[PDB]
Design a protein around this nucleic acid. Structure first.
Ligand code: K
Ligand code: MG
Ligand code: MG
Lengths: 52, 116, 136, 177, 75, 50
RNA sequence: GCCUGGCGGCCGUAGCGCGGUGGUCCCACCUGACCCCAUGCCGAACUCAGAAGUGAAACGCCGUAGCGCCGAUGGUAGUGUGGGGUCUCCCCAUGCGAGAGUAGGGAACUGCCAGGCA
RNA sequence: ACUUACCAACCCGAUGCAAACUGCGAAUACCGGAGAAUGUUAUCACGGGAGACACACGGCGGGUGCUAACGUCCGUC
RNA sequence: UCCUCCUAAAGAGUAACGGAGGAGCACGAAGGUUGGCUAAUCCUGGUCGGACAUCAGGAGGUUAGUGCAAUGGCAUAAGCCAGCUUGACUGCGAGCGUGACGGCGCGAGCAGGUGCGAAAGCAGGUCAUAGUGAUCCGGUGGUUCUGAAUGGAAGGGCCAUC
RNA sequence: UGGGGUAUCGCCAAGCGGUAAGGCACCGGAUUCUGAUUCCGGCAUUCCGAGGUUCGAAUCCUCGUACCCCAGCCA
RNA sequence: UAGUCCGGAUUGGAGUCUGCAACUCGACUCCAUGAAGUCGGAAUCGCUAGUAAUCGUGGAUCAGAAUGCCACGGUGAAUAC
RNA sequence: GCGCGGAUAGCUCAGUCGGUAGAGCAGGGGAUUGAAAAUCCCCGUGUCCUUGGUUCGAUUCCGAGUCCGCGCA
């Protein structure tokens, strides 16, 4: 990468309502509150209620 | 193709040096070796060659394929070339940037007396 | 009438018509109407002869016109002097040499091919002959 | 580097098990991830493309490259060398970090999420998808949006066939309806 | 609508093969590089090929593209 | 056509000038070129896009 | 002797395609990148520091003529000179003599230097 | 979404045409070098004097014309 | 008037109120050099997005591009992008090409000073071929070269230029 | 046949290469017993057809179409 | 002082009642949605005092269905040279 | 003979990349009216001059004819 033309990309910690505490690099520059994660999202139950 | 792109970068200076008719010092950089050879103005026959695959150079080095190795090769080609009466060559960088260890090799060949 | 759909230049030089032909064997069909005289053939003569053939061997058979005009012939109008440009494109000819198979026919007996080729060779300006499909 | 380590043990091992490769290097690996935002409405406005560039600067961690028009076409009122999109080529560590945020927290925040289509391979394994909102990335502030601007992702990988890319991407669990 | 043409430029090969030249002599006044420059031949700004040393004109065919070089043998 | 003629005058004390042509409309800025001055025999800055 | 790398001669009998094989060295991919240097974004490229891993890709080598490529002999076309006719076109004597096609050849040959193995 | 005597791109196989098409390519001509015989230097340069600059037909290669003209315009003899 | 192709008969040249097209400029970067890069079109996948604006991959091979016609060129690119720049220099010029001449063109090299490059080197405009106007008369700047007794000056010359 | 001109809403007629302006008409409302007049609102031609230059064409260029004007002479 | 805690149209869902039966085609309720509309062009209408204006209530027809019709009262003007 | 403009409903005429035949008037039916005119609405069995051909399909495109009209050395 070059010097400071890029935005500040610092490691933060995301946390959703699934109890999934997950630290990641993201250039938000702030800690994060979520609801849906990849763990415990209604994807398969969503497909089931779709077909049903 | 990386090799073919390099050769078409080389070609202009190659054909220009064959046009002037100057003895050329062809370099060749590989990820673990550098090769250097002095070629006659007819282009066919070599005169002097040194490289890091020679154990006379390779044993006195830590790692073949960095700037210290290339400086050793440039010193070797300059020494052997002065021993065989060759003084004034033209540097064929052979498609590489004159930056890293081809610059180290050519600077080392200029310190040890080879005129270019 | 046959004429190229779209040329590249409107007026062609005369040039000459020498030597023998290239289309010489009956290629597509089985019977052929082959030129012997030199001459050149307008598009009206090709159309006239094709109607004589198509009438003659009724809507059975299959007929190939192996020559195509593609050469524009210019004429000057009446009571116009010489000079002042090249004329205007009046019709289109094909240049014929001895050997051209002008037409081919297939799907009839030979005796109808004789008959249609007689009927249609009397609409052309060149001496003409009948050929068959020879095998090599 | 979380999914890069996860690759280096379990996806390499898993795909060596599934397909009967000989070489450990014959396994597919994801080369790069290009994020394009072909804005197109910047034929009249420059700050609109600047805001687009700020959004790809936020979604990835890099400045985008503002792309120019290759040919001039009159169907869309553009001209040769006129700036009309912006893209970021993510590769290396940032490819894996973005890929982690993408399949982990960005894809579930899609409205009405049914799944990603499995028939979106270009025949050589390279996935390409499109998001319709930039809001689905947690960095883009919802109070600071002016125009809704989707973008298209393209995972370029070293697989030869596209079923081999089904396997590679599906070993990251990468939803696939 | 017609009736115009330019003046004829007198291109072509001025010295043929084996023809002895002085230095400076124009060999092929031409329009692109239909003939390329070989040994002891220079190519001018309008692709005029001229004898850069004395000798004899040598037409050759070299290289991977079958180009038509013109050398000069030292003589 | 539209493209005018200007004199690049020498910055040394000589009167020596080169002469050339400028599009006055698209390039209204003056034209400074370090050209050769044969009276001084030296490469001096030249000015005056007329 | 076999293999590999560099620089050439030669410029498709030399290139394509299909199939097989190679890594001790060499080569390539590779590993990492704060530094030398670099990206109109990105160590992808360029560059640097290396050597864990694989020859997958690449590259080389060995097969295979499906194609490209070369290509006779003979005849044909044309044509210089002299002559002739039924003369917008041809013929004769004579000198030169194709292009296309056919039989066939054909998956190169080679020089200098360097390294590895026997 | 269901049928269809109609046309038809690209690709492949086969067939022709081209002054302003060429992945081929003569004869001749032209340029250069060497050699023999022959030719009243036939060659070149410089100087004195010109005339001439309306051409015609005939063969060959062509443009134009209608492959018309004892037509017209070139090239060459 | 000038440029390109054909006529034009395989060197050059070659006519007609023969067949076809163009010019009377542009550019201080579109010139110099150094370093790098390689097109058209089609297919597939992909937010708005569409036959065609961006992205990614493949086929393909220069069918692209070349400031503007056509021809000949171009990959070592003459095409495309970036850094630094003014050689778009001044005096000359062996030798050639081309014209009846006026004239026009190509030019290695020499001297002075410069740019780019580490260097070999390359650069006296642009891929080339059009983009033009003799002489007289006169205008402007420089140079005691002249300057009708003499010292100046006027005018003239010479160099640049309109 | 040559030279010049025109083609833009249903009709007559403006348009400067980056937007289509006017009048009459037509449509809706109002006035009126009803119609005309009047008054208030509207709409409206992607510019004769095809190709090209341009980032961009009603506009510029070329070709075709349809209609006008001028000339088509001396013998 | 906002298209806003204005305005309620429209639409989705869930219901209650009447009636053999609310799909064409009722009325009402609850949750959600939340248009147009910011005082109306030419023109035009009603009203002279318990009047106009404004606020509710009742009835007839009727199983259920009024913003209409017919009645009833509350507050209560301006102006007429 | 050559160059043109015409033939489409009873009458007078529209009608171009080939797509189920158009308008006005006439004629017929209906509304309206005391009745009628008027006004409004609805309704076309047209070998698109003949004849072949092309096309899945022709008023339309090609080939050949008949009749009318205009012009010409
Ligand atoms: K009618
Ligand atoms: Mg009638
Ligand atoms: Mg009529």
């Amino acid at each position: 990468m070059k010097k400071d033309i890029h935005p500040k990309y610092e490691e933060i910690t995301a946390s959703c309502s699934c109890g999934n505490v997950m630290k990641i690099r993201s250039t938000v520059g702030h800690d994060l509150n979520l609801d849906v994660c990849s763990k415990c999202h209604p994807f398969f139950t969503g497909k089931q209620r779709d077909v049903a | 193709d990386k090799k073919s792109a390099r050769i078409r970068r080389a070609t202009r200076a190659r054909r220009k040096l064959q046009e002037l008719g100057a003895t050329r010092l062809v370099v060749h950089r590989t990820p673990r070796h550098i090769y250097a050879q002095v070629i006659a103005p007819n282009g066919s026959e070599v005169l002097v060659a040194a490289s890091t695959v020679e154990k006379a150079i390779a044993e006195q080095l830590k790692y073949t394929g960095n700037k210290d190795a290339a400086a050793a090769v440039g010193k070797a080609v300059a020494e052997r070339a002065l021993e065989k009466g060759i003084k004034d060559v033209s540097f064929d960088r052979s498609g590489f940037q004159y930056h890293g260890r081809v610059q180290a090799l050519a600077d080392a060949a200029r310190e040890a007396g080879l005129q270019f | 009438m046959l004429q190229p759909k779209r040329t590249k230049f409107r007026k062609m030089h005369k040039g000459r018509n020498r030597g023998l032909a290239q289309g010489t064997d009956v290629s597509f069909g089985s019977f052929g109407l082959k030129a012997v005289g030199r001459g050149r053939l307008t598009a009206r003569q090709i159309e006239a002869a094709r109607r004589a053939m198509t009438r003659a061997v009724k809507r059975q058979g299959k007929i190939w016109i192996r020559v195509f005009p593609d050469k524009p012939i210019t004429e000057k109008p009446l009571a116009v002097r010489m000079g002042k440009g090249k004329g205007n494109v009046e019709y289109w000819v094909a240049l014929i040499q001895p050997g051209k198979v002008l037409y081919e026919m297939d799907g009839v007996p030979e005796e109808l091919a004789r008959e249609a080729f007689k009927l249609a060779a009397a609409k052309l300006p060149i001496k003409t002959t009948f050929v068959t499909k020879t095998v090599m | 580097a979380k999914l890069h380590d996860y690759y280096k043990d379990e996806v390499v091992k898993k795909l060596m098990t599934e397909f009967n490769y000989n070489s450990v290097m014959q396994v597919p690996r994801v080369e790069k991830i290009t994020l394009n935002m072909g804005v197109g409405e910047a034929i009249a406005d420059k700050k609109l493309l600047d805001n687009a560039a700020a959004d790809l600067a936020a979604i990835s961690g890099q400045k985008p490259l503002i792309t120019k028009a290759r040919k001039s076409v009159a169907g869309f009122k553009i001209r040769q060398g006129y700036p009309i999109g912006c893209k970021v080529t993510l590769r290396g560590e940032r490819m894996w970090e973005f890929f982690e945020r993408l399949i982990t927290i960005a894809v579930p925040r899609i409205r009405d999420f049914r799944g990603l289509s499995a028939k979106s391979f270009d025949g050589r394994g390279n996935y390409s998808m499109g998001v319709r909102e930039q809001i689905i990335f947690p960095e883009i502030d919802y109070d600071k949006v002016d125009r809704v601007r989707g973008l298209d992702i393209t995972i370029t990988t070293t697989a030869k066939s596209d079923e081999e890319g089904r396997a590679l991407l599906a070993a990251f669990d990468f939803p696939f309806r | 609508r017609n009736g115009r043409d330019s003046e004829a430029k007198r291109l072509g090969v001025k010295r043929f093969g084996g023809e002895s030249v002085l230095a400076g002599s124009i060999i092929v006044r031409q329009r692109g590089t239909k003939f390329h420059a070989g040994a002891n031949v220079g190519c001018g700004r309008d692709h005029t090929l001229f004898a850069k040393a004395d000798g004899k004109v040598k037409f050759e065919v070299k290289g991977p593209k079958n180009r038509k070089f013109i050398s000069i043998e030292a003589e | 056509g539209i493209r005018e003629k200007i004199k690049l005058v020498s910055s040394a004390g000589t009167g020596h000038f080169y002469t050339t042509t400028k599009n006055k409309r698209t390039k209204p800025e003056k034209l400074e070129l370090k050209k050769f001055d044969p009276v001084v025999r030296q490469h001096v800055i030249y000015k005056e896009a007329k």
